[PDB]
């Protein structure tokens, strides 16, 4: 996580960043006439890069503190999962950001950083669920209080993503303007967000399945069958929504990139379906 010398380097970095940004702001200020001129001066390349650095650093710090607040402290397994799975999605965000040129620069990185925080949250939530399953204790039942804590985390994520996706689809429906590229960007955000939502639904059904199993074992077929059934069901939901959304737009690149893995998952689903036929 954070070694002490890395924390020292972090302190150095943050303080020199604040120093740089304050100095550049003051310099651009005292050599200007009006607010608008100093804005046009800050928009210049070098100071622009410095301010972007400042925003990025402060945003990452805010996100790290929010992580500390929600998930408490992270385990080594979670941190390893993160350090391993980050670069793939990071390069994917690089792809979708470089998909759009200087015209679409700021909001793209904005929403990309947001969704990045969201997927990280999703992965941590999944691994915390797996931990809760391993560390489960039958001394008490799956009380409405511990289950309420965990499902409260879940519903926080669900509601925030739902509000964002609804705001975005409302903006899409309202703005049938000439910048169809911005609407396509919005729909890409919708696609990523609903992929995350389907991840929520799958994990939620897995949690309710395990809780109902707990309920039956305490009060009173192989669960793997129903687990695989729900997994392939959610994969069907994904593929259906991916087609129904990307076909309308008629995208040449995102379409194939998604559907190749969709049909590989469909091959695996056909294998599991044959297994079901075997147990049918």
């Amino acid at each position: 996580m954070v070694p002490e010398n890395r924390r020292k380097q972090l302190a150095i970095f943050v303080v020199v960043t604040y120093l740089l940004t304050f100095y550049c702001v003051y310099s651009a200020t005292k050599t200007s006439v009006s607010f608008l001129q100093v804005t046009l001066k800050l928009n210049e390349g070098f100071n622009l890069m410095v301010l972007s650095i400042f925003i990025l650093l402060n945003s990452t710090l805010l996100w790290q503190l929010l992580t500390k607040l929600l998930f408490g402290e992270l385990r080594l397994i979670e941190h390893e999962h993160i350090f391993e799975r980050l670069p793939f999605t990071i390069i994917n965000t690089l792809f979708m950001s470089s998909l759009f040129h200087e015209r679409y620069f700021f909001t793209v990185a904005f929403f990309g950083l947001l969704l990045l925080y969201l997927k990280v949250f999703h992965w941590i939530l999944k691994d915390r669920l797996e931990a809760l399953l391993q560390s489960i204790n039958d001394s008490t039942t799956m009380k409405t209080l511990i289950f309420s804590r965990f499902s409260f985390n879940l519903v926080l994520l669900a509601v925030v993503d739902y509000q964002i996706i609804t705001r975005c689809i409302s903006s899409i429906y309202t703005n049938q303007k000439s910048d169809i590229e911005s609407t396509s960007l919005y729909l890409i955000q919708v696609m990523e967000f609903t992929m995350l939502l389907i991840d929520l639904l799958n994990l939620f059904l897995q949690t309710c399945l395990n809780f109902w199993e707990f309920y039956r074992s305490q009060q009173s077929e192989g669960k793997f069958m129903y687990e695989k059934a729900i997994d392939v069901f959610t994969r069907f939901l994904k593929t259906a929504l991916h087609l129904s959304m990307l076909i309308p737009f008629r995208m040449p690149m995102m379409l194939l990139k998604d559907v190749v893995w969709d049909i590989l998952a469909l091959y695996q689903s056909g294998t599991s379906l044959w297994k079901i036929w075997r147990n049918n």
Binding site: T29, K30, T31, S32, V33, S34, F35, L36, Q37, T39, L40, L42, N43
Partner: protein, 603 residues
């Protein structure tokens, strides 16, 4: 005592305009505020230490001659010393006034230059100002037949400033002035080639950042010429050509030198002629360009005693032949060819051919259309366009005598001859001839770049009355510039500012934009808040961004209008829309607005 006074004064060389001495072998400072105490004390110190004792002696005997006897001729020269700061003496504005008063008593309204200067000082209130005496003196100076006086009267009657508006008198005066100016030219200079007088019509404060900021001012910067530019053999031709050019077209810091460029061109041509064949890739381009330049310089005669027509024609035909291969630009070459064989020789058909071959070129400004119109007038059976159309083209392009001829044609015929158009034409011509009306721009720059700042203010102030918007903006800027934010405003008197405001206002109404913004900001600083809206609206109507944002700002605070946040956000949308780079600022402003809104929602 005056004879020996003159014999001594003949040995001081009143002033050196460095723009010329810099031709044998930067920047400057403008002040920010003004205080009569500092000026008087600087004057005391200069009189104490700087003046040489010979100057003490000559100046004191001059004072004696001017006081004891009403010499009426030491008076004037002492006036000119104290006013234009010549012979290394400093500027005083009150002593000049007193001495001009005495001079005007002596001459009983008979010397017109003194009357003009007195009228200027009575209208500027430099020394209070009163328009009545100023206008009376302008009339009296028009009586004697002084040109600048008639011009400033015309500009006054044509702009509606300080008197009701009238077009008839202005048109009459402008026609008279154009008549006199045409009479001032000879037949050769007017027909063959126009004398090339360096232009210093630029406004100040464009060598520096600019007015109201950088990259924010709508009107494009006006600095036409300043040190034009863009490996052993190659760079040699580029360097030599750029040396020649920058030595022909004089710069602002350094004026022109001709004989140097002539000798250089002659040498390089004579040494490069034998083996031109091997310069095929690009050197031929600049080589033939140099040939064209040297040929034009031979043809005009500048830098030499007299023109050499035959040598010029030969070199021009050779350069044309060389340009035929690689098909380089042929503008000036064919232009000058058509010029020569039309007047020097009488072979006209080839001249018509050359003109028609050079018409569509870029290097021509207005000469071709002028020659064609005149020739078609002399021989109409050639069926070569329509002279009226030729004159329209020429005038639209910017050739000086074309303006006069086009005005004559458009007044002589209907052709939609609204008096406004004729007045505008004649005014543009008078303003643009610039070689007899306003020569003092050069003197003004000379005084500026040797740190004598006040006299530059005087000169530009005198010019601004004549209507040269550039002089107006320069004078106003020298009297008040916009201060950097979070810093004290200037410390000058009220009269200074109430004159600068009028100068900026007229500069705006003439067609310039930024002056309106600075005038609004001045009224803002003086805390009027009433007339500011007027000027800011007049600037907004012409799509000026800073004006829009400032109007929004003044709406949102309680001044004038009372806190109509709706129109405030509307104007912020306006400014965010009308341009691109300023998105962030408009958005952050609306954000501050909404923040104030929520903090008021709390209470």
């Amino acid at each position: 005592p005056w004879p020996e006074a003159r014999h001594l004064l003949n040995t001081i060389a009143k002033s050196r305009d460095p723009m010329k001495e810099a031709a044998m072998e930067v920047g400057f400072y403008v002040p920010m505020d003004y205080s009569p105490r500092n000026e008087e004390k600087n004057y005391q110190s200069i009189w104490q230490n700087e003046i040489t004792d010979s100057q003490r002696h000559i100046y004191e005997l001059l004072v004696q001659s001017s006081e004891q006897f009403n010499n009426s001729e030491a008076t004037y020269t002492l006036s000119q010393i104290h006013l234009w700061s010549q012979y290394n003496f400093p500027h005083n504005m009150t002593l000049a006034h007193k001495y001009l008063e005495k001079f005007n008593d002596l001459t009983h309204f008979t010397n017109h230059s003194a009357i003009f200067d007195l009228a200027v000082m009575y209208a500027t209130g430099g020394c209070p100002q009163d328009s009545a005496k100023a206008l009376l003196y302008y009339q009296r100076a028009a009586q004697l037949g002084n040109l600048k006086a008639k011009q400033v009267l015309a500009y006054k009657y044509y702009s509606g400033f300080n008197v009701p508006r009238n077009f008839h008198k202005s048109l009459v005066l402008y026609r008279d002035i154009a008549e006199q100016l045409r009479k001032s030219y000879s037949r050769d200079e007017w027909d063959i080639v126009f004398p090339y007088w360096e232009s210093y019509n630029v406004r100040i404060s464009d060598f520096e950042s600019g007015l109201l900021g950088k990259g924010l001012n709508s009107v494009p910067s006006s600095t036409v010429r300043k040190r034009t530019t863009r490996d052993a053999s190659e760079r040699r031709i580029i360097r030599i050509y750029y040396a020649a050019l920058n030595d022909y077209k004089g710069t602002y810091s350094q004026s022109r030198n001709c004989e140097r460029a002539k000798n250089l061109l002659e040498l390089t041509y004579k040494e490069f002629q034998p083996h031109v064949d091997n310069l095929d890739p690009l050197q031929v381009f600049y080589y033939v360009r140099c040939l064209q330049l040297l040929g034009h310089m031979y043809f005009t005669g500048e830098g030499s005693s007299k023109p050499n027509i035959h040598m010029a024609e030969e070199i021009l035909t050779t350069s044309l032949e060389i340009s035929r291969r690689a098909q380089g630009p042929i503008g000036r070459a064919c232009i000058d060819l058509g010029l020569i064989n039309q007047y020097i020789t009488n072979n006209i058909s080839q001249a018509i051919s050359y003109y028609m071959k050079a018409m569509k070129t870029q290097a021509n400004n207005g000469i071709v259309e002028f020659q064609l119109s005149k020739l078609a007038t002399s021989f109409p059976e050639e069926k070569i366009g329509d002279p009226f159309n030729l004159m329209e083209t020429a005038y639209l392009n910017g050739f000086i005598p074309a303006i006069y001829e086009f005005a004559v044609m458009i007044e002589s015929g209907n052709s939609k001859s609204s008096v406004e158009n004729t007045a505008y034409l004649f005014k543009t011509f008078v303003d643009k001839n610039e070689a007899i009306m306003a020569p003092k721009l050069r003197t003004a720059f000379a005084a500026l770049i040797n740190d004598r700042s006040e006299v530059a203010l005087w000169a530009y102030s005198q010019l601004a009355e004549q209507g040269y918007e550039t002089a107006q903006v320069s004078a106003a800027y020298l009297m008040y510039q916009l201060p950097y934010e979070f810093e004290d405003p200037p410390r000058t008197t009220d009269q200074r500012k109430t004159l600068a405001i009028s100068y900026y206002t007229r500069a705006f109404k003439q067609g310039n934009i930024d002056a309106g913004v600075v005038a609004g900001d001045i009224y803002f600083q003086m805390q009027n808040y009433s007339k500011a809206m007027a000027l800011y609206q007049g600037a907004a109507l012409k799509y000026s961004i800073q004006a829009i944002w400032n109007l929004g700002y003044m709406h949102e605070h309680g001044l004038g209008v009372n806190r109509d946040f709706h129109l405030a956000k509307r104007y912020y949308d306006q400014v965010s829309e009308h341009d691109h780079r300023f998105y962030l600022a408009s958005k952050l402003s609306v954000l501050k607005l909404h923040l104030k809104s929520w903090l008021t929602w709390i209470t």
